Amino acid sequence: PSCVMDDFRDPQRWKECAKQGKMPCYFDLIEENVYLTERQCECTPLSKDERAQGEIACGEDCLNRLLMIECSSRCPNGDYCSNRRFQRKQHADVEVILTEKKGWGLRAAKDLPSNTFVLEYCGEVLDHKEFKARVKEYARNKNIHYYFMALKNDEIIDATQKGNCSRFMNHSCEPNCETQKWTVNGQLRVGFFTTKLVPSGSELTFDYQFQRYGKEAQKCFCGSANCRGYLGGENRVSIRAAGGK
Amino acid sequence: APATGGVMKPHRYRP
Ligand SMILES: C[S@@+](CC[C@H](N)C(=O)[O-])C[C@H]1O[C@@H](n2cnc3c(N)ncnc32)[C@H](O)[C@@H]1O
Ligand SMILES: [Zn+2]
Ligand SMILES: [Zn+2]
Ligand SMILES: [Zn+2]
């Protein structure tokens, strides 16, 4: 049982597939972060000719790229800037699938070169007060899966109620993906990038480095030879610490 | 109090 990203674009069909167990449970799909309470490069423009030859605009040597800042619309390379991935939503070809013990997860729908942008991890951005409120609510509902992602000390991204398919990436003690923090329009975002060549059909995983505040830690089914056995590891941390202090 | 829960912590992959 698996689906493509566009199956998530039609809430009605999504909803009925969910009742048949054909899609994960419903959540609100959003194209970019939403704050619960609100708060140029030096590349030489690529010639028309060099672009037909297939050269790259804002490639490895772009100054914004190297600092993990995306270019604006005012970029010297204009429409041709390749350093706009988050804003252009140019994600990897990825599928959502039902795993054996982890719930739903993400699968590569074709070969993914090393260091390929996968998806942005989007959600409602929480401050400490909202974080703690949601901690309680989720504990109280008895949620199994957890979606909190530390962004910066006062900012947690909560993908529980709202987000995109990124909320499905499972943890692995030997992951093929990693988080990167990218600056887009003065604002900080997180996205997943492959850490190596990922053959078509393989599950996409990252290392959560999970900071667990719960009494009991969830067991890890990653199946890695080095598996640490639990999500969050050995230590339990305080809620304030998990939350960034 | 919470039986289960926690936060995913972004970090760069190092081998
Ligand atoms: C960001 S979510 C991933 C989406 C989730 N699999 C789902 O079906 O909604 C993280 C949750 O997935 C589950 N999970 C992820 N990786 C796991 C692993 N390696 N072993 C066991 N459970 C895992 C845990 O329940 C965890 O709270
Ligand atoms: Zn550039
Ligand atoms: Zn650019
Ligand atoms: Zn593991």
Author numbering:
A (entry chain A): 1447 to 1485, 1498 to 1703
B (entry chain B): 29 to 43
Quoted from the paper:
In this study, we solved the structures of an H3K36M peptide in complex with the catalytic SET domain of mammalian SETD2 and S-adenosylmethionine (SAM), or S-adenosyl-L-homocysteine (SAH), and revealed the detailed molecular mechanism by which SETD2 interacts with the histone H3 tail. NSD1, NSD2/MMSET, NSD3, and ASH1L are responsible for H3K36me2 and H3K36me1, whereas SETD2 is responsible for H3K36me3. In addition, the enzymatic activity of SETD2 is inhibited by the H3K36M mutation, and SETD2 failed to methylate histone tails containing H3G34 mutations, making it ideal to further study the molecular mechanisms of oncogenic histone mutations in regulating H3K36 methylation. To understand the molecular details of the interactions, we generated recombinant SET domain of SETD2 (residue 1435–1711, encompassing the AWS, SET, and post-SET regions) and an H3K36M peptide (29-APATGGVMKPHRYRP-43).
We then determined the 2.42 Å resolution crystal structure of the SET domain of SETD2 in complex with the H3K36M peptide and SAM. Clear electron density was observed for the entire H3K36M peptide and SAM based on the crystallographic analysis. Residues 32–43 of the peptide assume an extended conformation, and residues 33–35 have anti-parallel interaction with a strand (residues 1668–1670) in the post-SET motif of SETD2. The K36M residue of histone H3 is located in the active site of SETD2, confirmed by the fact that a doubly methylated lysine residue (Mly9) of the H3K9 peptide is bound at a similar position in the SET domain of its methyltransferase GLP-1. The methionine side chain does not extend as deeply into the pocket as compared to the lysine side chain. It is surrounded by a collection of aromatic side chains (Tyr1579, Tyr1605, Phe1650, Phe1664, Tyr1666, Phe1668) as well as Met1607 from SETD2. The methyl group of the cofactor SAM is pointed toward the K36M side chain of the peptide, but at a distance of 4.2 Å to its sulfur atom and 4.3 Å to its methyl group, suggesting it does not directly mediate interaction with the methionine side chain. Therefore, the contribution of SAM to the interaction between SETD2 and H3K36M is mainly to stabilize the proper folding of the SET domain. Our structural data indicated that the electron density for the methyl group is weaker compared to the rest of SAM, suggesting that a mixture of SAM and SAH are present in this structure. As we only added SAM during crystallization, SAH is likely a degradation product, as has been observed before. In fact, our SETD2-H3K36M-SAM structure showed that the methyl group of SAM has a lower electron density, most likely due to the degradation of SAM during crystallization.
